[PDB]
Design a protein around this ligand. Sequence first.
Ligand code: BAG
Ligand code: BAG
Ligand code: CA
Ligand code: CA
Ligand code: CA
Ligand code: CA
Ligand code: CA
Ligand code: CA
Ligand code: CA
Ligand code: CA
Ligand code: CA
Ligand code: CA
Lengths: 628, 628
Amino acid sequence: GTLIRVTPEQPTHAVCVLGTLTQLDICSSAPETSFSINASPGVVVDITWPLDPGVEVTLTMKAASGSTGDQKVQISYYGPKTPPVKALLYLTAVEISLCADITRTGKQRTWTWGPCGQGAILLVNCDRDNLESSAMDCEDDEVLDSEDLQDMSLMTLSTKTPKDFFTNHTLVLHVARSEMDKVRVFQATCSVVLGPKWPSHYLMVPGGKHNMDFYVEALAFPDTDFPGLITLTISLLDTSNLELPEAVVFQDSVVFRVAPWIMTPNTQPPQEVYACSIFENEDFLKSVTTLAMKAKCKLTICPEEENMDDQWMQDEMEIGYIQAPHKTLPVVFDSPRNRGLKEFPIKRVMGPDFGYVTRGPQTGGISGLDSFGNLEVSPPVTVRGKEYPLGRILFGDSCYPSNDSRQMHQALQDFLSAQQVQAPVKLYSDWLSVGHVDEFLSFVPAPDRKGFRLLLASPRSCYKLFQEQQNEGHGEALLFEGIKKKKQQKIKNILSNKTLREHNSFVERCIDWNRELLKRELGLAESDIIDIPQLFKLKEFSKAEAFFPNMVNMLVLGKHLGIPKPFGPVINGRCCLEEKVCSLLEPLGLQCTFINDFFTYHIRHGEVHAGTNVRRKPFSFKWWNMVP
Amino acid sequence: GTLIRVTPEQPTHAVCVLGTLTQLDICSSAPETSFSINASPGVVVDITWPLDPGVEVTLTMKAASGSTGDQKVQISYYGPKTPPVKALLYLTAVEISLCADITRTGKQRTWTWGPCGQGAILLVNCDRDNLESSAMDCEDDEVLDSEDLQDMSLMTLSTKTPKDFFTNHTLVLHVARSEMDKVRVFQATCSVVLGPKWPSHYLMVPGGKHNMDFYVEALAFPDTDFPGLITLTISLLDTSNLELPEAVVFQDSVVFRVAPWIMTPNTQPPQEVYACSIFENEDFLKSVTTLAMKAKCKLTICPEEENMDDQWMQDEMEIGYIQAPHKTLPVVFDSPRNRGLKEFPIKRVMGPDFGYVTRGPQTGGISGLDSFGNLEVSPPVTVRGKEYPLGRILFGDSCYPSNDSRQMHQALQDFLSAQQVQAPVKLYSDWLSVGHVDEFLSFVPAPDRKGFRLLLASPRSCYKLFQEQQNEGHGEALLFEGIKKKKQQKIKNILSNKTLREHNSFVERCIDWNRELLKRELGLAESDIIDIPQLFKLKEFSKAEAFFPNMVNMLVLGKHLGIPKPFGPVINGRCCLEEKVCSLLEPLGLQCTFINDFFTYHIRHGEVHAGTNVRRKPFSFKWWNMVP
Ligand SMILES: N=C(N)NCCC/C(NC(=O)c1ccccc1)=C(/N)O
Ligand SMILES: N=C(N)NCCC/C(NC(=O)c1ccccc1)=C(/N)O
Ligand SMILES: [Ca+2]
Ligand SMILES: [Ca+2]
Ligand SMILES: [Ca+2]
Ligand SMILES: [Ca+2]
Ligand SMILES: [Ca+2]
Ligand SMILES: [Ca+2]
Ligand SMILES: [Ca+2]
Ligand SMILES: [Ca+2]
Ligand SMILES: [Ca+2]
Ligand SMILES: [Ca+2]
């Protein structure tokens, strides 16, 4: 919008950027009725006319100018007995278009979500394409490798002006100071024009037709203090007068949205398995190695030299991804728990086309709920109309905060919620000694009704199974058959044990609370849910541990399942727990491999899921097409 | 939602909170077909029935229970040739309702905006009702005065239970740890149950019918790191088993929204005028004193003993308000500029039913754009459909950030935007030496087309006026007539002055940029806008100052206007500037008093608006009925 004031006293000189609304004030500075307008061929004057202020005269120009003032507008004032007084207006048209990929195909100043929304995407440049380095590429102010540009967003400036236009005009590129610390912009022919302490740069542009490519990288993920929008603006400045400041003539912008960190549920096909089972054990690895190969996955393992005897590969990290039309890459969220595996995500996982992020305090003030066995996601789900096409992050909390209760650190919770595309759901996991959601739930694929089953651990299902076994005359059958060093226990004594039943009654209560919570927040019905027979016992501070290997804490590699070997009562040549789990999951097309983890993982309060991790394929559905 | 599991083996015992969905799992633990249900009179079993899992059995209860298990449900399993096995379920119904004023009249766990939305309002307790104090009432953890409770939000807990119910159940009140630092909650019979380091409290409730009143105060305004929602939850805990942890049976919540700080435009009726013109001047006060009395306003003045010779009462503070169904009060936003007036808002303005807030760094790192002459609001306005019924905060910035450019501090900008009900608009004010939007705009009431006029300073209007004057033969007339000590200047030399014209041409450019910006962001047309004749000159660093008293920098007390006396060219016994301004505003019903501010304010780079401040009446329209 621009209102150009015209006068008979003086010719006015003005610039018209193509695609802008130009109007004329004819009345204000007229002499003394009536007026007529006549313009050169390249000027459409939409609108023999009375000189009253309320009449809108609008000038639009068809093409850019070859020279200054090469279009003209002549306003003739006349009336009763007065010969015409003409006022002159010399116009210079230019094209100034700041362009980005706002339709999100690989190629308004507001960013909108959804399949009909507009707005370019920007990735946080949190990987490390630089040959022999330790820092994320976005930590410095240089493009060090040509392949690094693939991670960045292209923005072009298209100018069509007279050859001499920038003698008296100049173009400046800027970002608000409130956002300069979150973006960096390079000019290509690479060198920095904008960034953390350069919020504006004067561009050197020649007259005529020119195109100027910029590459943009983001420096921060969306968070509590950053909704995730970055605006870059080009201003056109009139510097015609050596005795006056610059005068802005035109501004235009692009709004980028920074891509959120996104998790992958168990129903996304696996690509790489992680285990760091180089330590005292060896046959554990054999079995996961087999499943990886069965599942067609790369296999990376972390040796004891690196582990520091930390076997819990599930817990230090979570592999998600970031996604833009031009580029998708895996990104590792590094938990603050910082045990033996501390270095593993930064040294081994971060790298070429593998991003990195972390949150929370790095030197204390952490609980067990910050380890990422307590961090999962559901499969795609619609909940009473609202679609969650990338599912919903699930993490474990207490039911209310007390002196003795634990939570995942607020900084981690705030980061997950700020990603706003897997709208997190808080579940109750603090009744567990360890305290992770993966101790009572898993998800598995299925070929029908929604494409998955929620598995929950179920003391009810194990009592039912053992009771049926006793009814059929197998009361003498032994839990922990096949184990060299353990108090073996008969089904009959397990059932008569009134304290065990009390404990598993309370655990059942905790699990059922989550059941219903998941039914509500994921829109599940009973037919989405399979109960896995599972016993627990309360121990220190009345917190729950697994009575036998926690089968629900399994590795899900498509149809290939890595379930901890319950060393269950052997009936008709076969553990009846294995049997029961096989009768539950085999009809969905799942292959159950039971893995001996007993003296390696189980005796230390976790199982196969706890000792592994999986990088999975990112959703084909593009996060920006969601309406959170 | 609750799924109660029933068994023939054992009677189950369960609690049903009225208004909840209770279902029965009949199938899982049945013996072996068919089943029938029979319940005591107070239990409606909506649903001779086949024993397949997919059949929903739902129990609802009509009233609270007089004793434990006083309602019963009997599920009979039968079939081919088997005499009935009955399973027992003893129910105890209770009422547990956490109530607040969610319809917003003075009396879902999601807060929604608008006339059909739900959610109680909570005020930040930022005033000082305490007799002889210096702190805001919410700085400590006590209610010190009964009148302080008027500022707080009532929340009641209504329980109807058996006399013996809390022998084996307990109720806990809690707030998330992420929000405990922003709220405080008192229990009334006052003492703290929740707050900054007490996120949960066990309530002492007797059986039978009980009602427990709580009072709630907020401790922080919405900001970058606080959307403004506070959730309080009541949990019901089963503590029946001395050898097991508490088990949550039911949670319920209320979501409060903290009330935003809201500004009042010039079109809101004035109530109190501020001047701190106790210093070298005296006749300035006489004139503002007169207008206040004309306008029916309280008048408070800050003496030189307090001023520290700071006359700029506009600049240290902005008086807005906060509003809830139960309570509305004025609140002062104290600018970080911290000159002589520093103490005035904390000592004189904060008090009984007068809130306080401040932002930004208190000891440096401030610019002139942080003084609140650069902080205004427009009148109510609709913009291409979108209604802004409390108008839009307007504040001054540069057009782009450079080494030499100024801005209002980001913390101030972030606070204003987080109030989200007067969606701020950034204007261009940095071309001014001082740099405040009140140097080029004001708003005044009007009885037609929208209810106001935007006034802009206008060099074009003054040149037009002076030229018409010269045409009629008054070229010799003297700007600055009546002034003892100043270079007097003839209209003719003012007009022939080519540098003055250049300067005012550039100023006109800066003002016109804002014109159009305001047209776009406020939905204004030309007929909403009056130009006030006004000349400027560029000085140090090419920054604009007023050539004569800046008439637009006026005090607006309804129809009574306090305009700085331009000491303009006297024609036909009257300054022609005064005359022109009077011809512009008198037809709207405005009374123009021209005030001598010349050697007191004007010579120090401000005028009547700069030397005063106004507390105005809050909008009758309630902010929560908006849809930002
Ligand atoms: N469910 C999981 N994803 N992980 C469970 C990991 C269990 C693991 N256990 C232990 O680290 C442990 C147990 C006994 C002695 C020494 C250490 C913790 N607490 O982190
Ligand atoms: N337009 C306003 N609301 N306020 C203008 C106040 C002008 C005021 N001027 C001055 O403080 C000043 C001028 C000359 C010598 C010493 C001090 C500033 N800069 O704050
Ligand atoms: Ca780099
Ligand atoms: Ca890179
Ligand atoms: Ca770590
Ligand atoms: Ca890369
Ligand atoms: Ca995990
Ligand atoms: Ca108090
Ligand atoms: Ca109070
Ligand atoms: Ca202050
Ligand atoms: Ca009060
Ligand atoms: Ca103000």
